[PDB]
Amino acid sequence: CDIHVLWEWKCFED
Amino acid sequence: EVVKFMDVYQRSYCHPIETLVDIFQEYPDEIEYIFKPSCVPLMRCGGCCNDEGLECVPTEESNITMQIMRIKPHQGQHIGEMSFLQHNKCECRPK
Amino acid sequence: EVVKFMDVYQRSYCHPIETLVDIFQEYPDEIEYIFKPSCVPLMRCGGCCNDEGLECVPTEESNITMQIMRIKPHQGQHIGEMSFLQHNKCECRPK
């Protein structure tokens, strides 16, 4: 989940 | 009645957004005259990045031309083309 | 190829517009926190009144509630509801 790009939910729950 | 997390996060993430910009701001040497309208709508990069060390910056830009009125006191009304910078694509980049 | 005057004028004139606002500006007693996203999209008055005697101001407001991630020292990641002020109507009034 690279920080330079818009994220999916999986990036936050983890 | 409550905006869900992913919808707010996606809508606020770095992207071009219509912004209302005062013409004097774009062109501060022009603050001697009076423009109508006095502000224009421009696509400009806006919103937030996943981290405070990143900033939302344009990666594609273009000029847009608009019909604007300009006057000086006791002096004729003018209408002419004026050009402004627009942002077409934005990305989160280190500062 | 050129945006026409009346189109520019109508699009620029005082009205509620989606504006990206930093959460800290809206919650100044929580500047100890880190929020994700760090900014939220809100309807706020913007644009011009084309009279330097006048300013664009809200005349009708409401709240909207959004899910925001919140973390602070000695705390882990939380998600919680945060309320924000929106502008529903705007008008040009003397300054």
Numbering used by the authors:
A (entry chain P): 1 to 14
B (entry chain W), C (entry chain V): 13 to 107
What do the authors report?
Constraints caused by the lactam bridges and by the binding of the macro‐cyclized peptide to the VEGF site also made the α‐helices non‐canonical: in each of the four peptides, the residues P8‐11 folded into a 310‐helix characterized by a H‐bond between Glu P8 O and Cys P11 HN. The helix of peptide 4 c (KxxxE) was longer (residues P8 to P14) with a H‐bond network similar to peptide 2 c. Interestingly the lactam bridge cyclization caused the side chains of residues P10 and P14 for peptide 1 c and 3 c to be in a non standard rotamer conformation, the consequence of which was moderate steric clashes involving hydrogen atoms. The real space correlation coefficient (RSCC) of the α‐helix was higher than 0.83 on VEGF:1 c, VEGF:2 c and VEGF:3 c structures, which supported these models. At this value, 1 c had 6 clusters, showing a larger flexibility in this segment than 2 c and 3 c, whereas 4 c and the monocyclic peptides had between 9 and 16 clusters.
In the present work, we focus on a class of monocyclic disulfide‐containing 19 amino acid peptides targeting the Vascular Endothelial Growth Factor‐A, the main pro‐angiogenic factor in Human.
